[PDB]
Structures are given as C-alpha cells and as structure tokens.
C-alpha cells in the first residue's frame, strides 16, 4: 500500500513543519527571557527545569527517530512554556539562583538549535521518501 504510506509521509511533513514554526515562536521568547536574567523560590527553579527537561526529551526523541512520540511531547513542551509566561520571576532572586537558571535557559536554546536542525533534515528526508515512493508506484503499475 504505497498510496497509504505516502499519505502518512505528507501528514508527518506538515505536523513536523508546524512544530518547526512554533519552535521559532518559542526561540524568541526564550532568548529574550534569557537576556533578562543577566517558599515560592522552589517553584521557580522547577518551572525553568521542566522546560529544560522537556527540550531534552524532544532532542532525544529526534536523535532516536521517535517522531510519533516527538509530536505527542510537543504539546506538553508548549504547555510548560506558557506556565512560565503566566508566572513572573519572584522578587527573591539571588546571584546564585539567577545564574543557575541562566544555565538552564541556555540549555534549552542549544537543545532547540540541534532539534531544529534534526527537525529540518527529517523534512528533507520525507520529501525524498515521497518522491521515491511515487516513482516506485509507477514501476508497480507498469509491471503489475
């Protein structure tokens, strides 16, 4: 069933391309909040650690080719960034906790630059797979 698998290639292409566009919406929000940093204190480290951890999950799933699971984790990664948008920085910021978060915010940026680079090469591979599958469909109709 080549026609059915090509449909899956097209559907995954648009879903990954939509994620690569929302990846730039969050890349501008994280870069500006990063430069803005250069008891409720605990629930401030976790809000920026959940972002750094979910960005690690997406990069690991991209390296391992789990694209279906990568699209399920995109939702939780987008929900976690909005939780940082609703809640501002607490007033009690020490020089040590502010620069520790600045290392976690910088971790997500270097994780998205590798994630976007991997999310792009999958779009480049899916375009090859669709082209090869339609050429293979012409062979099967002639000899079938």
């Amino acid at each position: 069933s080549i026609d059915e698998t090509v449909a899956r290639y097209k559907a995954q292409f648009t879903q990954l391309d939509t994620m690569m566009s929302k990846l730039n919406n969050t890349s501008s929000y994280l870069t500006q909040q990063f430069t803005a940093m250069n008891t409720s204190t605990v629930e401030f480290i976790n809000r920026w650690q959940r972002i750094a951890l979910l960005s690690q999950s997406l990069l690991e799933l991209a390296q391992r080719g789990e694209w279906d699971l990568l699209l399920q984790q995109e939702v939780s990664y987008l929900q976690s960034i909005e939780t940082v948008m609703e809640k501002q920085t607490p007033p009690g910021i020490t020089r040590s906790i502010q620069d520790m978060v600045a290392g976690y915010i910088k971790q997500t940026l270097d994780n998205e630059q590798l994630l976007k680079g991997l999310l792009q090469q999958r779009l480049d591979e899916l375009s090859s797979l669709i082209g090869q599958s339609t050429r293979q469909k012409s062979l099967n109709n002639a000899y079938g």
Binding site: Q132, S133, L139, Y143
Partner: protein, 331 residues
C-alpha cells in the same frame, strides 16, 4: 504486413506455446482486454511468430513491419530492477528494464528474496515481455487506431445509439474528421469510452466548426469530468503545475502577434518544465500542467514532444468545484 507482431527466440517458445507453459498468451489477451475497456477501443491482435534464426533469448516487437523494440528474457531467471534506491549489486546479466530504462540485473531464482531486501523490484520473465508489449501499446495508442478501427467503432456504436450516429456521419462530420478527433484523444491518454458525449457535443459544434483540432478542444471540455477524475480521482486538493504569470502573458502575446520570444528561452522552457515534473514528484502530486485554454494545444504539442509523461490540461476542463493549488511553477 501485420499491425502488431512479435518475434521470439526458441527459448521463449515455451512462453508462447499452448502445448506447454504459454504464460504470454494469457497475459497478451488480458492486456488487450483491459486496454479495450480502459481506453475504449480494442487494439490490433498481436501476431506471435517463432524465429529460430533469432537469438535464443531475444524477442522483437514490430508495428507494420518496423521494429519498435527489442530485448532479452530468460524464462528460468528473474529481473531485478533498480529504481534508484537499491543497495549493493547482484550476480547475473546486467541489463536495462524495457519500460523505464532503469538499471536491472537478471538474477538466479535463488536470489529473489535477497534482491527484495536490497530494494530491487523482482519481475518474472513472462511479465518483462508482457510489460514491454503493454508499454509500447500505450505509447502508440494513437497510431494503432487507424481509420479501419474508426469505422469499426462507429458501426459498433451505431447499433447502441442509432439516432446519434445516423444523422452524424457523413452529414455533419466525415469519417476522416471523426477519426482525427479520436486520434487526438488517444494521443493525450484521454479515453474514448464515452462515445455519447463525444458524438453528442460533435453534433452541436460540427455545423459551426469543421476543423478537427478545434473540434477536439471542444470535446475535451465536454469530457472534463473524465479528464479531471483521470488525474485527480476523488474530491481532494488539486495540485497542478502552473506558468509564471509573466511567462503566460509572454506566450499569449507571441500567439497574438505582439512578439515572440528568443529560441533560447524555449530551451529554458523545456528545462524548467522537466524540473517542474521533479518538484511535482517530490510532493506526491500528478504530473499535470494547467494552462490558459488558448495556450493548451501549443504547450501540449511542444512540451510532450520531449517529456511525454507530462499532461497538459486547460482551465476550462477542470471542474469548478475542486480546490486548485499551484504546487510548481515554470518560469
């Protein structure tokens, strides 16, 4: 001589013998049967003849005595076709597939499953010859439809719907004109199955038009539902190649006598079209080029002469309810 003939070597005799194997005879009958129900006319019979002077595994395909294709076939072996994505190589006689010209290898029967895992398409010997024969029939569909088959089709449809055919030939259109219109339809892979709409719309435009090329254009719009569904089956997004609006007006100006383009720009038009077939292929979209109605016969005859796989439809033929998106551009 014979309209469609095929000569074969003595190793292919079992493939073409009812006394033993004869796998080809059943396939050739099925080829002619489906061709009569798809394109709407029965192709000429294939005269098969043994030739012990020919090479043992060689076959020839002739049309009116002229050789239109040769090749080899080994009944005990399989042909491993490489569509460009296969890996490694297989032992056997390296050759070329007769339909698309791809690289292929005749492999022993013990390598079929390994060929498949390596990405080859493995095809049996009788299918190689049948597919080659079936490929040439579609390529010469217009030529194999002579004036004899025109009269034969007319009498066949004159008994089904006598009121339409009686008043038509040779009153409004002669047999030569009707034949040339049907040839133009097969020449662009549009079937002549719906003889009602073809002849119905012929009777409405024959008293006002006697040009076969002009009558063909009107018929294609009358067959627009069939032409649309042939390349865009169902009800989804129609993805076509288009012309750059600057190029479309340049071409309309050249036909209107405002000034033609340089012959070097024509070479780019052929190249940009072939690139549009590749870009359309990477998207899983049909290889069709949608152009303004005034430009359709020109670009069809011009591009398809070099790129026959290209389909050129006019804007007046696509159904107005479909969602059209231009996925590739020439220019």
């Amino acid at each position: 001589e014979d309209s469609l003939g095929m000569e074969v070597g003595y190793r292919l005799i079992p493939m073409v013998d009812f006394q033993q194997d004869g796998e080809l005879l059943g396939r050739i009958r099925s080829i002619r049967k489906k061709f009569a129900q798809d394109m709407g006319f029965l192709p000429p019979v294939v005269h098969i003849r043994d030739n012990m002077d020919l090479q043992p595994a060689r076959y020839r395909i002739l049309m009116k005595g002229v050789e239109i294709g040769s090749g080899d076939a080994y009944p005990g072996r399989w042909l491993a076709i490489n569509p460009g994505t296969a890996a490694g190589t297989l032992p056997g006689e390296k050759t070329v597939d007769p339909a698309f010209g791809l690289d292929a290898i005749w492999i022993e029967s013990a390598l079929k499953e390994q060929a498949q895992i390596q990405g080859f398409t493995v095809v049996e010997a009788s299918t190689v010859v049948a597919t080659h024969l079936n490929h040439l029939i579609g390529q010469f569909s217009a030529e194999l439809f002579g004036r004899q088959e025109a009269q034969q089709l007319l009498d066949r449809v004159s008994q089904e719907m006598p009121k339409l055919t009686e008043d038509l030939v040779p009153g409004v259109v002669t047999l030569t004109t009707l034949h040339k219109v049907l040839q133009n339809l097969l020449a662009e892979k549009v079937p002549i199955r719906d003889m009602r709409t073809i002849l119905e719309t012929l009777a409405e435009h024959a008293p006002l038009q006697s040009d076969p090329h002009e009558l063909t254009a009107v018929v294609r719009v009358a067959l627009g539902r069939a032409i649309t569904q042939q390349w865009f089956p169902g009800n989804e997004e129609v993805q076509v190649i288009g012309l750059d609006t600057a190029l479309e007006r340049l071409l309309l100006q050249a036909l209107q006598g405002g000034g033609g383009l340089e012959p070097g720009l024509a070479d780019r038009l052929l190249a940009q079209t072939q690139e549009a077939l590749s870009r359309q292929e990477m998207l899983g979209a049909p290889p069709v080029l949608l152009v303004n109605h005034a430009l359709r016969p020109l670009l069809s005859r011009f591009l398809r002469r070099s790129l026959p796989q290209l389909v050129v439809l006019s804007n007046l033929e696509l159904s107005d309810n479909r969602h059209i998106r231009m996925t590739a551009t020439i220019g």
